[PDB]
Symmetry: C3
Subunit: 421 residues, 3 copies
């Protein structure tokens, strides 16, 4: 039985009082993690090679995830059964070294550690033919699925509230990788096409985006005993809302009172990313990220995002270090032109099982400080029926209420463990 996973768990306090709090800029899609995570999260994998005959083999893999608030011992929770798939390597003579798989599986996820941001992830139930050797590089094919809460209707109606049927979306993915465009550099290219797949006779709202495209290109260059990736992505319509490769072609959302509202996503998004990890000598290691993301929608409710931060680690011993992280966000509302921003600074003393910034288990003792000044927010007051601006970007003082997080300060501090096995 193979046992693997990820887990993070801990204890913390807030300067001003009570249990620890975490800071994320309103409008951004990520927070700088170090000493800024507030949950016990864990994935327990148990897989096993069930048959091998020479080169031919069949691997079985599973993954059950748990997320709890870590404010008590006995914490009950509905766990999520995220993967249960089978991969068969070399079973097809004519296309050697390639795998065929089917099942619920996390498929080639591309992410950015310090921000816990995943920029290319189409995982879900699915199937595919992986690593076909095309000579200059390796070609892979896959189809995965997702499905939005409602968004379809049993009959034509002008009433949005009639569109409460779960509406399924399909994604077709093609990638070409490990192409050595230069010395030390590699190039991957991928194309994603997603569409809402409707039941016989159901209909979507008028103006519903229905489908879309995602185009990815990533260059991986080896450097300073580390690496540096530079990405460029472009998405259209149904691919813009999630922006990782999954489609939401229905345009319909829901208030907590189950009333439907309209989150139409026709428009486009452009992402420019560069992140990496380099070692500069024997006593220093450092991770870094820089990004610019622009979601411009037809309905003027997009955003323009900027981030940068660095995590330099200095090693006193092969198992004791002092890690520090500094990050900055700035988000501008497409609808109002106002700007939200913040910056975080964390200082931690860790003990890892490795001489790397990439090595875990790690045990930390830390202190974090953050100052923000947010001038806009999302209007979620009311009901999607009571409110006509439900879900729209509005200024901080709109109609005398307060929107946004304010212009304030805070510091927290505590102890935590983190680990992938």
């Amino acid at each position: 039985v193979d046992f693997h996973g990820y887990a993070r768990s801990g204890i913390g306090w807030t300067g001003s009082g009570g249990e620890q709090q975490c800071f994320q800029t309103t409008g951004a899609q990520s927070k700088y993690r170090l000493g800024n995570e507030c949950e016990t999260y864990a994935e327990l994998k148990l897989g096993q090679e069930v048959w091998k005959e020479g080169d031919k083999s069949f691997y079985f893999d599973t993954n059950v995830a748990y997320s709890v608030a870590q404010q008590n011992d006995w914490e009950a929770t509905d766990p999520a059964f995220r993967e249960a798939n089978v991969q068969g390597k070399n079973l097809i003579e004519w296309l050697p070294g390639s795998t065929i798989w089917a099942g619920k599986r996390f498929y080639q996820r591309h992410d950015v550690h310090m921000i816990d941001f995943y920029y290319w992830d189409i995982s879900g139930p699915g199937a595919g033919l992986e690593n076909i050797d095309v000579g200059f590089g390796k070609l892979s094919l896959a189809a995965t699925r997702s499905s939005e809460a409602g968004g379809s209707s049993s009959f034509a109606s002008n009433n949005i509230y009639d569109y409460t049927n779960e509406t399924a979306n399909d994604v077709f993915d093609v990638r070409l990788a490990q192409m050595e465009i230069n010395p030390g550099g590699t190039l991957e290219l991928g194309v994603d096409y997603g569409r809402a797949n409707l039941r016989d006779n159901y209909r979507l709202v008028d103006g519903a985006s229905k489908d879309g495209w995602l185009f990815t290109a990533e260059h991986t260059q080896s450097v300073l005993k580390g690496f540096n990736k530079f990405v460029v992505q472009y998405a259209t319509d149904s691919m813009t809302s999630q922006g990782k490769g999954l489609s939401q072609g229905s345009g319909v959302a829901f208030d907590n009172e189950k009333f439907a509202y309209n989150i139409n996503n026709n428009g486009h998004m452009l992402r420019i990313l560069d992140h990496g990890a380099i070692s500069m000598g024997d006593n220093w290691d450092m991770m870094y990220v820089g990004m610019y993301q622009d979601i411009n929608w037809d309905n003027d409710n997009g955003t323009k995002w900027w981030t940068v931060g660095i995590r330099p680690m200095y090693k006193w011993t092969p198992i004791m270090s002092t890690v520090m992280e500094i990050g900055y966000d700035n988000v501008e509302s497409q609808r109002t032109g106002d700007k939200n921003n913040q910056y975080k600074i964390t200082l931690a003393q860790q003990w890892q099982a490795g001489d790397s910034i990439w090595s875990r288990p790690a045990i930390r003792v830390f202190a974090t400080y953050a100052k923000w000044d947010e001038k806009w927010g999302y209007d979620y007051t009311g009901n999607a029926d009571n409110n006509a601006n439900f879900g729209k970007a509005v200024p901080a003082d709109f109609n005398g209420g307060s929107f946004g997080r304010g212009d304030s300060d805070e510091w927290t501090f505590g102890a935590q463990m983190e680990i992938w096995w």
Copy 2:
């Protein structure tokens, strides 16, 4: 740590549109599985021999099941803790080779693969003395439990709605097996007696069945490098509703609005079964089933069921085959004499880890087609209070509404994995 289980997971599409659908005849208790399963289902077992001293040993066993819709990545679910038992072999000198066990355990289940039908299953919490050698065969004894949602009352009342207390049922099982009635053939005989066990002073409805019998006889004959089982079962009253060995002696049910209705089951059932798997040479394998089941109840709401189907596999290679399944159902309403029926045809190309129709992991690519013509259905419109025919078999056009599945067609197709380890 011993790791075992079962899991099935995949992706699919329906000809006419949307995610894949599955076909089961209204009134039948099973569907022909190949390319006709719509869930990710999985059982993860982790057991371990905890003590051995010679012949004497103690085994610990557990089983946690998960069922999800496989239409998304993160799918939370309440898992079911189905087994947690301890079996002690040879601990009793005077009755050698026998085991004593206690705990929640799946106990000697008899089922029919292609239809996923279990015809003899009394699993649940329980205890027993297993495999006592009686010379001509092996004798086993057990007591297991079940409990219906409500059906008991704290005081005598004429009001059904007063009978909302969980009512427990007990089962006492005795089997005698591995009797060689002929060359290559074996005979098992079993008797099940179930009864509702009431709390001091509680009462059941008038006319409540209260108890019942299940009688089983199964002959296993070795043939064509395979086998063929022929079963005959007979049940009375409380054993007729579930019809696998568990008792439901209260006769009370519940609408989604929690109103109680009366599903009295006095009557009887007779089942005739023959299924098996045979290899005809080196390039062909085939599974087959034939059944006739008649539930005749005192209230005229029974059914008369017929099924037949075959799954012949032809092997191109020791790991590539083409499997095909053809099945047919026909159910007649006891109350109305009308008949529902359907037939399915599936064609699949698989890759297994074996040269057997019985060997998994398996990875499939398939297409299924089904045509049905149902003339009767169950009336579930309304409320058990609003409706007086709530839950009764009624014709397709009864009071102008539509009951049944209709007279239609459809085809689906996709990819799936399946595996027991």
Copy 3:
């Protein structure tokens, strides 16, 4: 992968009718377990040493618990993710043999088997430095967390119902152990300080206890090839309600209708305990417990508790025994001076994997008998709004209703498995 746990599961019946019942004296905090447990409970641990370099190592540990009613096969449940921590041994040169850990962890629990009573348990999320060698003994330090459902308010109000905010409590623990005060004897001393940690600006009710102390001293003396522990504990205010080391400094509770009531706990508690297990020769083993616990609160609603019982085992064979348990409780209401009491006698024939009263797996067949005479109870009739005595100790016949369990009898009997691996 290391696999460990605990599990208990089984089947039972009640003399007078229905599924088995269990007996616990109203007002006591425990029941004598043998043949008196009514659930399938289980903890599955999967941990693993992930890195070792000489003396230095990092261990990863997890624990998922399941509790079900064992009255049916398929029993769905929300499981509780109770531990997920990392312990690093010898990572700090200057304080050898000591461990630093962080994460959700069960930390040094002290309990009494036959009554399933835990008398010193501060487990929960947390962190600490363990086993520092102080020469005469070993010194350990830790901080763990808990959090009450509500009890805090966003603004000052006189209305209790305004205090519905989850209010977090912190605990700071210090222990000094393995001090050989005598030949064969050891002494542990510990101090716990708990307090409610409020969010900036929140307030607690007036009179709220807010904090408290727990003082523990335990002497472990080796005897009759077994041991005997003698404990003395003293707690004040917020430490009195749970009385194991966790703080509940808010004083607010909640009716099932979510109305808040006031369970103020200013006061103190004193506990005197002595329990142990001794072998007297080769054919006898016996566990025993004696306790006196007095919770005296400012609001007159405390209790004065007394227990004693013994579990003597006689061994016919190295794997067959006859175990018997006899227990007695007597609880007196501080508010009314009335007394509740009961006594239990169980007789069982077991088969263990060991010649010890402490050895499992065990498989039992038993019969239990209990007679009680309760003269007081807690008033839970009504609503915390409807009722002004909601939650108070009141006599058995108060206002003509019946409170308490009565003056009665009963016997049950069945089969069960129990095991820690």
